[model samples]
Target: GHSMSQSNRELVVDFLSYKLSQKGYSWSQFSDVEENRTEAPEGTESEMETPSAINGNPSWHLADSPAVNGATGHSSSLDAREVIPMAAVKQALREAGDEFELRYRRAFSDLTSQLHITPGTAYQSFEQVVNELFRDGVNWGRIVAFFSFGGALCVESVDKEMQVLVSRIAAWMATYLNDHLEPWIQENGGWDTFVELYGNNAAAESRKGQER
Candidate 1:
């Protein structure tokens, strides 16, 4: 069975968040890598194939982590029916499209500039920026908003490289959430609190608008 590695941990953790939140579970946090490791049970095979886009990135492997999912006694499926509404997400995605290009350019440009002047890759610079954002009081709500923005950009981008870049940024954001943000989320009453405080009401209202 394919195990969770550094590269694929972000997406896998994000999937876990979705699964747990759908079933009203509280996610725990860990600074220790060993404590947070995601693995599979005996003899269970990984069902999905790695995308070609994820090649060359060993950190992008799929992880099997039913234990994390079992925290709430819910099935480990990302597609559970009671998850956040797709239509709401689509509405938010459409709204985010408005600023996608500007944010994409500014964010990547900042990373490029840092790389040109410093000793790191683009993603290293990105990691630095993300850390700084965390230190400067960036919240899960804002972080998720940026990832949503990147996703919107990824969908609209025609260039393969552009799409890849945005997708990677989105994935990196997810990784940061699990690694950094989620711990704090758990401390401050978990993602359920965050959602109650700042979840997407726009989506709910959008659904209401549609139903009428």
Candidate 2:
């Protein structure tokens, strides 16, 4: 109940794909690989064994090497490996989401109601809100707030029937994370550290409790 929901996972994928697409690639390309693998009889075992691999794409792993786009001749600094594993980041966000709902969502709702964010001004408002969040400095609590903010924006956008903002918000969040947050995250031992600190281990153990 507290982990990344399926819809939230899709939001993460959409964020990832938006980043990839900016570099002349598509997320569907990776999904194609996943589909092909699923068609193989031996694939299920490997899939279950390494669910974190995300179709075994090396780019999804670590940022040991620069991911250079040949056509554009631009090298990206935000490779999944160089910062944190995508799966781990997702887990961190999952934990953050739980924290957000438990502690911040009510206040966030009150703030949003006063802000009167509309589709026309949503992007601008988003930047303003997030910029203020980081104005003091970045910390684990602020980072958690960031994810909560993004989720809240997505939910609001959907309610307003401006689903287009969801993709744009995802892309913007990715860019901001890469440009402003990754270095700090890396210094703090990346998302893996975040997950270790905040993960719902009790809930995980409870599942095992029921298995018996």
Candidate 3:
């Protein structure tokens, strides 16, 4: 019945993410923000493909956009399979990873490319770019993007319900792996007490509280 899992912590995160949005940080739509940053001399499709990542940040890339963000789509799912299956787009989760620079670049490239690439960009404002990306991808957008920034940012960027659940899951995975991800998970408070109090029952109960 709920859009996200029920968790007190997640509630907090969701509230914060929305507040951040008010402060000019967007979650889903990306491009227009970039246009402001780059002041890309707009052109046409011929211009976008030619303006390779080499010219910009090495970590960033771009492609075509599907649905418009913010405007409620026909569906709610983020699973790539629900839509047309592209042989090239095999693993949605795996491809989900994109660092800040990459995300920033991709948003710009796609937004500007979609607009100016067909013609010359007529100087769209930074406000427009941020608005567009923010408008798009309410549910699955941030989660899928998690792989790039790693899961914590994903959880952090999301609403509180999603954030709490993601943190719980991330913490579990982190401890089980006992590595880089492990450290992150511990900070998120998903990991059970391994050293403190010899993994007390209270700790066990705390994890039980989260694991659900």
- Model 3 alpha-carbon drift over 4 Å, by segment: 1-149, 156-160, 179-212
lDDT of 3 by residue, 101-176 (tens): 2456433334444322111122343224333544543223443343332233334333433323333333332222
Write the residue-wise lDDT of candidate 1 on 56-124 in tens digits: 554436755556534463454444233244233322322332244235443443433332222222466
Deviation from native of the Cα of residue 91 in model 1, angstroms: 7.0
Clashing pairs in 2: 62-81, 62-82, 63-81, 63-82
Given candidate 1, what's the lDDT at residue 192?
38
User: What would the TM-score be for candidate 3 when compared with the true structure?
Assistant: 0.17
Clashing pairs in 1: 7-59, 8-59
Q: What is the alpha-carbon lDDT of model 3 when measured against the actual structure?
A: 0.33
Q: Give the number of the best model, judged by TM-score.
A: 2
* CA lDDT, every model vs. true structure: 0.40, 0.50, 0.33
lDDT of 1: 0.40
**Residue 66 deviation, candidate 3, in Å?**
43
How would you encode candidate 2's per-residue C-alpha lDDT over 1-212 as one tens digit per residue? 22223333343444344333443243346532322223355444654676536665656456576565474544555443232453544444554455554474434555575445555645666566667677777666676566656656656664575445555666556555545665555444433444444443333233445563
